[PDB]
Amino acid sequence: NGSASVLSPMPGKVTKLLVADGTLVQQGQAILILEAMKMEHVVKASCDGEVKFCVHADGIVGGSTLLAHIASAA
Amino acid sequence: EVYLFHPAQYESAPATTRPNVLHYPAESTNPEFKANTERMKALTAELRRRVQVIVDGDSEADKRARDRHISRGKLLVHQRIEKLVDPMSPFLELSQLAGGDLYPGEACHRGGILTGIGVVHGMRVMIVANDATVKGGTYYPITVKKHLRAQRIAEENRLPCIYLVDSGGANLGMQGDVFPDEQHFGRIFFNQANMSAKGIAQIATVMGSCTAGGAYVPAMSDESIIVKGNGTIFLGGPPLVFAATGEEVTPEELGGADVHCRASGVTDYFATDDLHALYLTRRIVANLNRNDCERPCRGREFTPPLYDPSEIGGFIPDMGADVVKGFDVRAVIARLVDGSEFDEFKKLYGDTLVCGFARFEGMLVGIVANNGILYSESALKGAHFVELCSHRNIPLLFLQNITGFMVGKTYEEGGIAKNGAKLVTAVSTTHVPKITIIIGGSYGAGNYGMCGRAFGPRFLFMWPNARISVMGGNQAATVLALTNSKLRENEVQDFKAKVRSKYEYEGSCYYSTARLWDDGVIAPEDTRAVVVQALLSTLSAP
Amino acid sequence: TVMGSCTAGGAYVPAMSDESIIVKGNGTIFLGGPPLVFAATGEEVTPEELGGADVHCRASGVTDYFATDDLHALYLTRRIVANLNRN
Amino acid sequence: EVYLFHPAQYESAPATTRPNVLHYPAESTNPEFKANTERMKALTAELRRRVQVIVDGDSEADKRARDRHISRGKLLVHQRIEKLVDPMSPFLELSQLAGGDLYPGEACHRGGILTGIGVVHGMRVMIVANDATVKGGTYYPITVKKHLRAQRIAEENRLPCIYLVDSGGANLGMQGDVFPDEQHFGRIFFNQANMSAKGIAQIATVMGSCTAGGAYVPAMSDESIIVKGNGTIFLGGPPLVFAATGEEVTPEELGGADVHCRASGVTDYFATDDLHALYLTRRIVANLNRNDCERPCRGREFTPPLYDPSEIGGFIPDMGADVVKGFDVRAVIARLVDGSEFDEFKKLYGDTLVCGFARFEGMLVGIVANNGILYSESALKGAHFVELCSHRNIPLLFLQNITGFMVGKTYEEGGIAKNGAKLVTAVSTTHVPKITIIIGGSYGAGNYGMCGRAFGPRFLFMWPNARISVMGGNQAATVLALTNSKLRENEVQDFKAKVRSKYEYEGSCYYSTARLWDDGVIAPEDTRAVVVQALLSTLSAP
Ligand SMILES: *C(=O)CCCC[C@@H]1SC[C@@H]2NC(=O)N[C@@H]21
Ligand SMILES: *C(=O)CCCC[C@@H]1SC[C@@H]2NC(=O)N[C@@H]21
Structure with missing residues (x-):
């Protein structure tokens, strides 16, 4: 899909955005790191395009919470 | 323009376009990659240093004992291995670091005994040699355990056993832990008799x-x-x-050679010295009427891995940390299997347990590797894959980096215990050879689901960074602090530090190795080689 | 049990x-x-x-027999043994 | 005051307090109960009437044929059965109503052949007797099919076969459906030779x-x-x-008796008449060196059901209706098993598939019965129960009243097809004897999950109210009307009525029976008896 509205897998804390806001990311490319149960889980981009984050870093998310939008830049 | 090719064209394609080839190039410029490489290099250097000081001896007492041993016209145990095996052939020494810091006040090098799989006259045999320079060769409890482990491996793989005997006997100081029990000194003779009854040759020198x-x-x-x-x-x-x-x-x-070789009849061959004894051992092995191969097919048309194993450590994070980072185990698999080819079984279902088919020097192997927390889906996928490999007589390779299952009311309600039980049953009841390697951490029941020591793998090895415990150190600290209501708020950090230190000490690779919990510690870059040897040792199994 | x-x-x-x-x-x-x-x-x-009896006996399916107390549990154990088709 | 008794006291208790006793008293004053009883009584009366007119003959042509048969000094086929079997013993005639309305213009009574399991000299045998009063005994396609079915039952249960031969041969009018195929006339000789090679005696009179x-x-x-x-x-x-x-x-x-008994050597025994022939058959059976019983244990200390089977029909609703009511199958089970005792396997998990253990005249049997729509949980429970019974060599009894699985996006996403496949695999690959009875409706893949005809049950019987189809009549009508976009709104009711009538006609018990889709139609009150006989027939199986 050209939008790629991915949801969080489980409640946890977003620790670090591995890519800056507005950066082009390929498929399967890490965009942010989610920490839960003292384990680092890394969220990957599902398609090529500019990634814009929705949730602020160093915060907390819930089950099936939207994280970022991957818009295919022309 | 549509459907122009044939699938065989993709099957026989260069590595760039072959679709079942794992592509995990090393990010050598990444600082985390360099830090991981430095850590792995330090760990492997320490491992090699420990093995070398065991071989060459460190203290002056070791030097005196070796001087006494040489002055008697005796060869050292590793020298006996070198001169008994074929001159240019591999030797899979199993418990190199057994007995390390196990008994205070004693440097029980190798556990007082050297066990390995060698090649004599082209046939793989199990060699068990006593080290007379370790307390006169007396059997510690660890010595008995290692001897029994070697006998178990030889019996389950039908490897002929060679015992190079130089031992005072069981040590009377710890006779309670050596003489009376099922898994004690008499079990050696029980195993020897039962192996001899099964047609597995038993040779004593x-x-x-x-x-x-x-x-x-x-x-x-x-x-x-x-x-x-x-x-x-x-x-x-x-x-x-x-x-x-x-x-x-x-x-x-x-009880000298003359009385037991001319009158008593206990022994069959009279040896003038150690070299003649090893020659006679080789002659005995030569006359075992064991066929060279049941199937003369070779199938050695394999391709080496497309990525250098020497950079595997770059992908391995620090297992001992407050928050442990995750990595893709496929990057490891790409550096161990033939041509970096890997047919993944359920790529989109498990997503935390990677199951697939690969080849080691042409030998087909099913690989089950951990890639995160075990779920019900991952356990079901692993059980199904193990059943699939069992129905095809495909050997299994487990790569353990596991930190338990997923907790929660929903997951228990979904029957996660039942699915973990299905995986455990599939692993336990299969008959194909199983080899497991602890590349990360093995904690709790997840270990049981991944063919731990209790589930009878043919071989089990640990990387120098590996940790094995009933639970993770951070998890143990947190759970013990939360449960212990007696503990005061003023004494929380000290308690957590103490339990973390205890778990780090008792979970280290050397702690496990000294207790025969594994079959030795190996470097990641040697992993492939080790696996191949292990697989070959299983080719003579019934 | x-x-x-x-x-x-x-x-x-x-x-x-x-x-x-x-x-x-x-x-x-x-x-x-x-x-x-x-x-x-x-x-x-x-x-x-x-992980109580209700969750493992009505939804999870891990357990097969719901026992009200220890005596009922032992009775169900005897009933299970009775139905082993062992000569 | 707490925990005063012992569980054995509850195990040996009167029916009021024994906890594994099903208590389903008949609500004889309920109008629905009376209506169900009247329907079942009418159906059973019709069944008995059809069997009686087959035995006694209805048309004048049957009377003429029987007069010709008697005038030749020949016994009728049922009379031959009566005088061949032990005088007071059960006889399980299988396809009583085969060939009913199957070929237009011919009253193919019993399919031209009588097949059953009788007792000769205390040994259970399979008897196949040609009926010379049905078109001279010529083999219709249904005759060949019934003969092959009898041979299959005898071979899989190791029952000696007795063939009372009086037949003109294959009928040349339908030779295309009789002579050339795998399941055709030559398969009789194939089965006979293979059974003889396996030590199963083949006797021809x-x-x-x-x-x-x-x-x-x-x-x-x-x-x-x-x-x-x-x-x-x-x-x-x-x-x-x-x-x-x-x-x-x-x-x-x-080819008379003299030429084949004195010169040719084809036959071994010369019979003066039918009675002498049956005596010689009994003498042949007497000299089969077959042991009376592998184990002399009797185990006949059983108790009859605590509820009268004659009221089973009270609990059975009208299967052919716009909305079919549901009932508890346990009320049926309480009227079929010893002492109305039933140990339910997962009482709270399946909730639509009742799985449990029971006994028929002391013989332990696992019962799987439908109690609603099949779900993933019910399919998993059934598969687990079938595996449990297979590991214990416990015969299985299926009671089919099934109207397919649960539909929907959530259920498919949960893997209902996978669980149904698990149930089908467990049923298909088991080796214990399986007996299935269609008490309600068997529709679609659910039939496959409940040991249908295609899955090799030892025996399969249908109640007179049973219906078998690829889908329910109402379901077929609704789905066909919705799918067929060509159909106009003015022609909807007629199309639904036509398809409902077709499905009712082709799903009736008699339609199935005439085509050897089952092993006969039995009354509900006789069900227990039938099961017992079937179970006994399986006691000689390897
Ligand atoms: C802190 O270290 C404790 C957090 C919990 C550890 C997690 S919960 C899910 C995994 N299963 C398990 O046993 N441990 C892991
Ligand atoms: C009307 O008669 C059609 C309604 C659907 C029939 C139901 S849906 C759930 C069951 N599965 C199946 O195949 N038929 C039943």
Whole structure:
């Protein structure tokens, strides 16, 4: 899909955005790191395009919470 | 323009376009990659240093003992291995670092005994050699355990056993932990008799002394060799015969080579020295009427891995940390299997347990590797894959980096225990050879689901960064602090630090190795080689 | 027959058996205990609502027989033994 | 005051307090109960009437044929069964109503052949007897199918086969559906040879004629009997020999008893009449060196059901209706098993598939019965129960009243197809004897999950109210109307009525029975008895 509205897998804390806001990311490319149960889980981009984050870093998310939008830049 | 090719074209394609080839290039410029490489290099250097100091000896007492051993015309245990095996051939020494810091005040090098799989006349055999320079070769509890482990491996793989005997006997200081039990000194003779009854050849070469129970080792073997000067066999030693009948006899005139080779008939071959003894051992192995191969097919048309194993450590994070980072185990698999080819079984279902097919030097192997937290779906996928490999007689390779299952009311309600049980049952009841390697951490019931020590893998090895415990160190600290209501708020950090230190100490690779919980610690870059040897050892299994 | 608690590795004992019985009040089966689930997800759950007899006998399917008390559990055990087709 | 008793006290308790006793008293005053009773009574009366008119004959042509048969000194087929079996013993006649309305213009009573399991000298045998009063005994396609089914049952239960042969041969009008195929007339000889090779005795008694292919039946049997006057065996009949060589010979001088018993050697025993032939058959059975019982244990200490089977029909609703009511199948089970005792397997998990253990005259049986729509949980429970019974060599009893699985996006996403497949695999791959009875409706893949005809049950019976179809009549009507966009709104009711009538006609018990889709139609109150006989027939299986 050209939008790629991915949801969080489980409640946890977003620790670090591995890519800056507005950066082009390929498929399967890490965009942010989610920490839960003292384990680092890394969220990957599902398609090529500019990634814009929705949730602020160093915060907390819930089950099936939207994280970022991957818009295919022309 | 649509459907122009044939799938065989993609099957036989360069590595760039072949679709079942794992592509995980090393990010050598990444600082985390460099830090991981430095950590792995330090760990592997420490491992090699420990092995080298075991081989060469460190303290002056070791030097004195080796000087006494050499002055008797005896070869050192590793030298005996070198001169017994074929001159240019691999040797899979199993428990190199057994007995390390196990008994305070004693440097029990190798556990007092060297066990390995060698090649004699092109046939793989299990060699068990006593080290007379470790407390005179007396059997510690770890020595008995290692000898039994070697016998178990040989019996389940139908490897002929060669026992190079030079041992005073069981040490009387710890006789409670050595003599009486099922898994104790008599189990050696039980295993020897049962292996001999099954047609697995048992060969004994008496390079030194064997007293009391140890005297059964030459007598219960199919063929035995005794060296003239240093070989003595008797149930009752000279001290015992003097304390009983008041007679003084030297060991040579009591149980020397002449009495046991010309009159008693206990031994079958008279050896003038160690070299002649090893020659006679090779001659005995040569006359085992064992066929070279059931199937003359070779199938050695394999391609080496497309990525260098030397950078595997770059992908391995720090297992001991407050928050442990995750990595893709496929990057490891790409550096271990033939042509970096890997047919993944359920790529989109498990997503935390990677199951697939690969080849090691042309030998087809099913690989089950951990890639995160175990779920019900991952356990079901693993069980189905294990059943699939069992129905095809495909050997299994487990790569353990596991930190338990997923907790929660929803997951228990979904039956996660039932699915974990399905995986455990599939692993336990299969008959294909299983080899497991702890690359990360093995914690709790997840270990049980991934073919741990209790589930009878043919071999089990640990990387120097691996940790094995009932639970993770951070998890143990948090759970113990939360449960212990007696603990005061002022004494929380000290308690957590103490329990973390205890778990780090008792979970280290060396702690596990010294207790025969694994079959040795190996470097990641050697992993592929080790696997190949292990697989070959299983080719003679029924 | 789960007369009491079975936690973590012990939870494999009921699940790997051919037939299993769990007692209502005192029977609990879970791989992760309430302390572990609280330390992981920050949620508080009682052992009964985590791995009690109702969840493992009506929804999970881990257990096969629902026992009201110890005596009923032993009766169900005897009934299971009675139906082994052993000559 | 707490825990005063012992569980054995509850195990040995009166029916009021014994906890594993099903308590389903009949609500005899309920109008629905009376309506159900009236429907079941009418259906059972019709069944008995059809069986009786088959036995006694209805039309005048049947009377003429029977008069011709009797005037030849021949016994009727049911009379032959009565005088061949032990005088007071059960006989399980299988396809009583085969061939009913199957071929237009022909009243193919019993399919032209009577097959059953009888008791001769205390040994259970399979008896196959041709009915010479049905088109001269010529083999219809249904006749071949029924003969093959009897041979299959006998082979899989190791029942000795007795063939009472009186048949003109395959009918040339339908030779395309009789002669050439795998499941055709030659398969009879294939089965006979293979059973003889397995040590299962094959006995042939030629009460009448056997021409062309049928002549192989006496010749391929271990022992054969031919009656003097009426017995003739030849590959080529008198018409064929006259059309070939221009010679006229009577059947007696061509293949009579004298030529085949004194010169040819095809037959082994010379019978003066039908009674002598049956005596010789009994003598042959007497000299089969078959042990009376592998284990002399009896275990006949059983209690009859605590509720009368005669009221089972009260609980059975109208299967053919716009909305079909549901009932508890346990009320049926309470009227079929010993002491109305039933140990339910997962009482709270499946909730639509009742799985449990029971006993029929002391024989332990696992019962799987439908109690609503199949779900993933019910399919998993059924598969687990079937595996449990297979590991214990416990025979399985299926009670089918099934209307497919649960539909929906959530259920497919949960893997309902996978769980149904698990159930189907467990049913298919088990080796314990399986007996299935259609008490309600068997529709679609649910039938497959409940040991249908395609999954090799030892026996399969249908109640007179049962319906079997690829889908329910109402479901078929609704789905076909919705899918068919060509159909106009003005022609909806007629189309639905037509498809409902077609499904009712082709799903009735008699339609299934005439096509050998089952092993006969039985009344509910006889069900227990039938099961017992079937179970006994499986006691000689390997
Ligand atoms: C802190 O270290 C404790 C957090 C919980 C550890 C997690 S919960 C999910 C995994 N299963 C398990 O046993 N441990 C892991
Ligand atoms: C009307 O008669 C059609 C309604 C659907 C029939 C139901 S849906 C669930 C069951 N599965 C199946 O195949 N038929 C049943």
